[PDB]
Symmetry: C3
Subunit: 190 residues, 3 copies
Amino acid sequence: MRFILTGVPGAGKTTVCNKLAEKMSNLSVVNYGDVIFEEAKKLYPSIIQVREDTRKLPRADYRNIQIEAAKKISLITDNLIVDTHMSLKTPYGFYPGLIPETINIIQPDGIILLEFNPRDVIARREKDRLADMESETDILLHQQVNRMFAVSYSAINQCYVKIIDLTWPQEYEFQHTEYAVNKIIEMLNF
Amino acid sequence: MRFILTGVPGAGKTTVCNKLAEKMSNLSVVNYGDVIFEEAKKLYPSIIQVREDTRKLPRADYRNIQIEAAKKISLITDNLIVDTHMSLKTPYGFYPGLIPETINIIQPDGIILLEFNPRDVIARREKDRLAGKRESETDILLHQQVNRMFAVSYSAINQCYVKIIDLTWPQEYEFQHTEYAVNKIIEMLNF
Amino acid sequence: MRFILTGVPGAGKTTVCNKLAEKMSNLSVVNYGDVIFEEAKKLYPSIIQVREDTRKLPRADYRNIQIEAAKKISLITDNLIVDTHMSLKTPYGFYPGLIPETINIIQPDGIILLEFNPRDVIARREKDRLAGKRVDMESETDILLHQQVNRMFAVSYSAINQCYVKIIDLTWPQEYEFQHTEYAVNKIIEMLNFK
Ligand SMILES: Nc1ccn([C@@H]2O[C@H](COP(=O)(O)OP(=O)(O)OP(=O)(O)O)[C@@H](O)[C@H]2O)c(=O)n1
Ligand SMILES: Nc1ccn([C@@H]2O[C@H](COP(=O)(O)OP(=O)(O)OP(=O)(O)O)[C@@H](O)[C@H]2O)c(=O)n1
Ligand SMILES: Nc1ccn([C@@H]2O[C@H](COP(=O)(O)OP(=O)(O)OP(=O)(O)O)[C@@H](O)[C@H]2O)c(=O)n1
């Protein structure tokens, strides 16, 4: 099956992705941003070198890069999970991290939203930073906006909208990760 | 005045639809789900024998039976209410009951959303279950919120009304919620 | 850059618009409804005496009037702020204040939503009723519902056309009068001049 996987940044989504790729063989976990960056360097090497450089392309070139990345991802046969962000915050507001062509090419079966507790998000972000400074309301608003984006994409393309709740206190560290991964594989095997 | 009536399952939507069909003249109350089930069954008599078996069909064939159901119920003239669910929950999450083709084929004027109180919903569901006629507060409220989002998206795309009848208040007597909703819908139709 | 400023009516949106016009140079602030009314009067002077008379129209002609108003608004060159509504409460429910033709013709860089505290909304509605004209009055929950529906409309237009969705929070309590207006104007200006 095919699912997009999303959530606010810095909350532990990458750990979920890697522990999924670790605890299932018939699975492919890919990052839309990584494929976008690869296709960009291959088509526009004279300009691109790091993720940060993907901003300098015009919106038409960036759209074509997203389209080609979605295509290359489309040629995957096994159970697929596409890690990405539905919305990202900017000085102008929330900007969608996807485009309708992405979904109608990848044609995923569903969209999975990892909804964490804002306090936990702040804690994880601060920890990883010691290795942006939002508040609880900012993160809650971001998650509700992501809900709305997912529901819009679903209404347009008719797909599933799974909301995985990780807003409960962990009994042991990294438990949210295991709960998310176990429920995701339960979905994949049914 | 053709409207799409929706709400979380097991809360009282069907009683509202029935009392509408009984109290309103020149009003056709049609169940999108039953029509889809019938059409799918008759066009694929081998693979389809229960309602939720309609998920095995490939994307194209399911969308085609939905298109045929929408065309069939669009032929109805005058005023009609379409009983249906805007989203149903499954092991894979929330799944929509409509598609843009369905909406612009039925070309409805508005979408009515019956938003109940989750406690009332739990009570109704269990009372029905005990009578052999067939989630948590948080889950029900999330379902209603995603239904609201779906309805707003459909309205933004097709330009239609989004009526939200709020039955979250405690009843003073049985069937007060459904009576209030039916009367609001009838004053809407007559307006 | 082009932004569509919106929010529930009677809460101070036009105050923000007029003060933006008064503070920042090279900023054109246009009211979609005003343009629509002018064009309606132009093409149908036999029926349109005032704004509400626009209900007399059939929906197709009014939609085309909206399209012509959006066209005229798109002809503007520099920084633009289109004051309008994402939804309107009617007997039949919420109706979108925009149409897809508006989004496509204006190509707005973003949408902006002023989210108020319903108490302030009600108080300002009743005050502007007292001190002047503007002859179904809503409640707190109704206003919250309206704001959430507008948020959903905005996210939908963004997901469909890929534009920004800025939410300016004016829910906190004002320490002095018109503080929300100053805050909204300052934030919109900071956003426009961002480099
Ligand atoms: N249950 C968890 C999951 C994650 N973390 C911490 O939170 C951060 C996770 O970051 P990451 O998974 O990389 O965040 P994303 O949401 O995936 O976004 P980005 O690529 O920007 O990091 C790390 O410090 C990780 O140790 C944690 O403390 N407890
Ligand atoms: N105001 C109400 C509305 C409903 N009910 C009870 O709730 C059930 C009616 O729900 P129904 O309208 O049948 O819900 P559906 O929309 O039919 O949901 P489903 O498809 O799951 O049945 C019946 O037990 C009815 O007595 C009630 O007690 N008071
Ligand atoms: N921070 C603010 C902003 C506005 N107002 C009051 O709110 C009233 C109504 O706001 P208005 O300026 O009329 O803005 P709109 O919301 O755009 O009104 P309408 O939709 O009726 O045009 C005004 O009289 C103004 O004094 C206020 O008290 N405090």
